[PDB]
């Protein structure tokens, strides 16, 4: 008995999920008292049911938070036989270092609160780090974008005479699995950045001079490691500049700082609802969610997906 | 040992406890990255400390509720010898019954949540019923509002021949207690729906036309409980209305509700922070708070400022 | 894999819940050693079964407490796929608040027995307060007595001009919802203390002289609270009095008090075993107890039964 | 702070620990209500204490059990520091094998019962099977009687011409220890019986017909096991019998079956409340236990007591 | 989905369990790398599965340990639905009281460390002693060898003048067993360990005359408790001495005190790899293994094959 | 009262530590038994005692896993007041990462089997990774080598021309931190593992040009980054290369290949025990290991140390 709800956060991908698998989004409802208190409610039964609930991390981010736990913790107490937390992006997989005494290790932290809240497992894509994953001791499915955002530059660029690069030295190993799948070369522009030498602006690695540049980063938030990249870019030589990202997160001034940015286009997944853009384009991932949350039900293989 | 720090839900009620035990403020900085995730930090040790962290559930709530929930398992992580959740006010503790199917009992959930973020304990007061005491494990001290409601009754309104009422049965149990250590008599009213149609068709208990009514209620939010009761005292005979209650939400209409109605004077806490009003009088509790937390830090009774 | 066993506690409602869906009583067999130290056992394999164990707390309570302790242990011991605790009567609900300093939330410490023990759900009918619900992790079941207790009135009484009454406040929501099912108006009383001096000076509400009064609360022990309504009500007016409750407890000085009040009739369910008396009706809730398991067994909607 | 309190199962021996280090037996109340229900309550306060509950599992046991479990739960409800189980008798250590298919383990039932009512260690004497430490999660102090059963036989029986008896095979270990410890040969008499050859009373292994039998358990129940034992020892020769054991439970027809037998005195702790008996003698373990809490309160060696 | 897997320990016993099954074995890998670090991984889906890994403790044990520990959070990891760890020889089923102070009881350690990598239940045969079971939270299914052994026995011994002989009072109780079910009488042996290779014979129970002495233990180890007694039999005019024990261990001096002593022949299972022997025989476990994870699988009766 | 203890891994180190703090190295005795089962024994007391247990997981890895467990397990059974489990070399941590499908994260898993043996608290120095921190929920003090390591150089080599280089990504944070505190300029390698013995450089990144080249990283095991590190330097221009760890592994072909390498000198802390070579050198972490302890007993800052 196969059954999907959805927060707040991204009711579209959550819609959209259900009906890829020909299934109604459930009924449930949250309200928001007077005092600012949740209040949360499933509609229908949810009894014996294998319950799958959507929320992405987005603003604002501490009422999804609490309204997923809410609707774990409800769907428990109304008998559910399993409960699934569906999180398309898990924004405090940021939060996964102690780089400063004395603070939280939040994605640690949010793990154990979902787990007592009573979530069975987790669906997610293309988390920050990949030791997130030990984060939880309940069962963690990690989906890759890797597919869909290599099917779009694959379609969309023009592969003659592109590189893809990495601006982040942490970039190094998502842009290099990217190279092998679309048969490109692989270059570096300064992590440092060269703090006594003579050249102050960026120092190269690889051919980029003659070349289309393709970004794939994990997020783009601020849009701030985006534009740094690609001004580096083309002063660096290059002709033109495409960027990739899983969560297009696209907050504070991020959307003005792309449009003044002369980088063609940037993709980003709909784990994210997305923002209006010219510029910016979205990879639809409901299809994989929806392949995912149907071989978890039945007991098929997930990783057949990306192998 | 004795390290006191606060939230951003009510840090003047924390820094008039601290100044009221002869210690300063803990220091301690949380933010709001671009994408609206917290981040807690605490600049000095609390290494082996016994800290206590002020927080009420205020708007916005989830904000608090997470900079609480991550402050505690910082405190825990910087290796607090222990750590005690002081919520003045627990608005949560609202949600403590299953009356609709397939909700959350919110106010169990977060103190499991409390729990597992690694509070050791609470020190609350006047919870909405008693029975929240028992959604949690670890040691709960549930400071009473009654000393302080009295002593503001008997110092500025000086009423022979007066009556004290409820508005809710329920809150029967704190006016069959102020009343009678006033030495006054009783009345109470009881119906719903405050989520529901206008305000509200009530039914009233006692003899109040030739007697002057003062109210005691848990909280007061919309202000439609204190309103009711004010209109249906003050029409069926009765001189003059006073209200007191602990928590002073003050939310919604509530403000100008005030206004509008024919009440004298509302009293309330500053359990949460005190908003400006043109008949609204606020008592201190800090004193109060102040002398619980000296106490658990000590071993000595906190059960005799009760008695 | 729907298996049915009782303790020692009320045996006859198990068999005819057992009987009421067409399967027969689980053989499992409870001794005391010289010692007085308990023995479970059961006789029949318990694999991978959904199992259900009927006990309530009657006296001696401690040994039907441990038993069920100890069967629910045995079945998961046992490899049952499921275990639910069926306690028709749980009177530990009583014991739902901290009203004295330094004693045990009874009712709490039990639900944590009872996971421990290794049950994974509870039904239950009629418990003394609302907010017990949350004492358990574990999934609850809460049947409602109202419709037998409304079809006893209805079926042999026939008052037309009658009044609907409630013990106490608290119970208040038990006779603002019986009441006005049946289409009559309200009354109620409010006091303490039970465990305290004679039988007891109270406080009545609402119009009783030229009606006749019908009684509803959550349970009979010392028939105490019983007899003080029916004093009041019968005295201040009031043709006659009958009486119900879900809990038929009735302990210490009630069968005497029943026969000694001017109180017609007194009406109980088997959720504890009938006791022989005059004037005492007794309702069997075997077809709703094994209704609501034959539900739980197949993953219908419980809630239905309700509405 | 080191406290001490009692149930109702051994107020002497409880009050002669407390004694023995010059203090006070704590106070605190438990009550029966008039449905069988309990009801526990500390008068004075407990906070930041280190306290030891002192409970045997004697008749009626099952109160008893609960009576700890709740007095365990309301200390650290009232803010103890540390709360120590101290059990005497462990009647349950015996329920330490799953014998037959689809019962209780009992003994680790009642441990994690203990422990999820808020145990933090436990002191006992003379558990039936010293793997039953092992069902223990939380620190046990497991406390030997050899040294005061040694003394009362190297003191009371004339060990000339003396020997050492196991009836059980079972018994073999600490009545080899005895042996040892006095000086004095083992002997053994059948256990099966030997159900096939000439001889059908029972078989006699070392020397036994000259000499005093010296007979050591762990408990005394039904005195079945030791009247049997003293009968075979008689008719295979020997001159008299003496008894010792740990926990005198002296239950059904034992104190009869003793004043029948020839054994000439049976030696018992006062682990349980002593019974009336020309025969029987009680050799105190108060000082014993009273070190050892004195020891554990301090962080002092305990086990250099018996080493 | 039934799915067998191994580890390093005993690969043809988890074939020859598998095989009897009518299944293959699992594909899974155990990598050691160059710092002796393991790694383990599954190389197909396991996922809703209910997994069994079977595991022996024998040498090298603390590899085996974790690698079953790796394997079965691997598992669960893997989103199996169940997971037993099937644990033909737990060696550390010895380590099972605190008989000095200040020990690991590892028994209890490892059984509480294999809930924590995530086992659902265990499935193993002839634990040393009968509390072992107690150390378990989590189902045991406990199988006994007594059946193959007295298959055995009928096939290759007279037992027209038979004798069953137990080598310690810890092992009575299976000896006991299989004296009742050939229809033979019983003998014993009181043990004294002086150190791990050492043990010394205290006395000897029983008729054996000039009979053919079938001993039986749990486990054959050093071989010191068996040639001791056989020695003891020996001198006590017994004709002959077989001998059968469940685990056959084989360590340190055994094979060569086995080929010295008149023992006839040394029969042990296969829960541990064999070892070459002119004496040795080995009588397979894999069909009776195998029928109980038939069984726990189907949810059908596991106690049947002893019964 | 402070207590330190060592397993077999690193005895030395323990020494050195209990000597810094001016205390003796405590009493424990670890035995395998012929069977290859470990046994762990405390000699004296260590009752309400601060225990520190030096443990690092050097070969035979996973029999020091073992003791560490049975050891903290062991110090909990007798009545530590707090045990802290000092792994000066966690190598496991390298296993934080799910790379394949249905492997087991194998640092978390440890982690958890370290809280459940009973450890309170870790100690432990220059973890693979920086993420590894939240798989523990006990509090963890991360200490760093940096300090010593630049003591050393700032002693051995001309800083002059030097320029600190990681040998890959993973390694870059705490490079960069050396190369700042230094004054020195930053460089690094882009390393793709082909298996535990072989690696490639992708990309060398930085200014070397003809200078003193000096590399650090976590740890060496294998030395195939470092020597493939060293030629890429080499043959880039670099005048000579001083390489600097904190684990000194060591295994597989490692001496072999530094002998043969030009790199000058290669030196490690002491987390794990040395090995002789003429280009080794060893670096003592006691003091700072004595220092963290000595802070972590009396609550003392730790950060302190690093900052
Ligand atoms: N959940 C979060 N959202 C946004 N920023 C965060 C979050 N958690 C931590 N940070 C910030 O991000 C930085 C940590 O990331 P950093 O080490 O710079 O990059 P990377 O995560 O790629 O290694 C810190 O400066 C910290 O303040
Ligand atoms: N935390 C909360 N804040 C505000 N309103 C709430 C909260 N939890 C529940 N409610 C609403 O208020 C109702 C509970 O109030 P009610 O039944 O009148 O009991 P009480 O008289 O104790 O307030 C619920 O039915 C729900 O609609
Ligand atoms: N389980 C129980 N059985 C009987 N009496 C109890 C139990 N628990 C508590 N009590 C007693 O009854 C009182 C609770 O009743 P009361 O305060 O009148 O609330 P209610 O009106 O909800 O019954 C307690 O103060 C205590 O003395
Ligand atoms: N707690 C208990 N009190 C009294 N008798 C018990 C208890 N638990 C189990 N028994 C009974 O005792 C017997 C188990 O003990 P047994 O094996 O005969 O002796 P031993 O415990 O010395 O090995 C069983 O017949 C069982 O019915
Ligand atoms: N896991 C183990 N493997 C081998 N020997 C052990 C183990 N654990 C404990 N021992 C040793 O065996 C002794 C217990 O043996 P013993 O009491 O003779 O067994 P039993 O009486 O149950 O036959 C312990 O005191 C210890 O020296
Ligand atoms: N505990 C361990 N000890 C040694 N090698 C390991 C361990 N755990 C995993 N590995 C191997 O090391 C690989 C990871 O190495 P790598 O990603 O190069 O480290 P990093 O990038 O963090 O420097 C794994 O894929 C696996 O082959």
Known sequence: PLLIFSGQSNRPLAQAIAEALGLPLGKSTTLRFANDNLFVRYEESLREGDVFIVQSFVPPVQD?????????????????????????????????????????????????????????RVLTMTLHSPQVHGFFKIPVDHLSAEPVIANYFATRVDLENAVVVAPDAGDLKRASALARRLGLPLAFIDKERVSDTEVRVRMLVGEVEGKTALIVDDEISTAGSLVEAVEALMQAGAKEVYAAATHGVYVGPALDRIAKSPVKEVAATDTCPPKEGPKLRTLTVAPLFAEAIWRIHRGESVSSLFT
Chains 1, 2, 3, 4, 5, 6 share one sequence.
Do not use: C, N, W
């Open 64 to 120: 999804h938070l609490m309204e997923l736990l809410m609707m774990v913790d409800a769907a428990k107490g109304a008998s559910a036989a399993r409960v699934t937390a569906v999180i398309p992006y898990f924004s405090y997989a940021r939060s996964d270092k102690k780089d400063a005494p004395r603070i939280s290790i939040t994605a640690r932290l949010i793990a154990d609160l979902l787990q007592t809240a009573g979530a069975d």
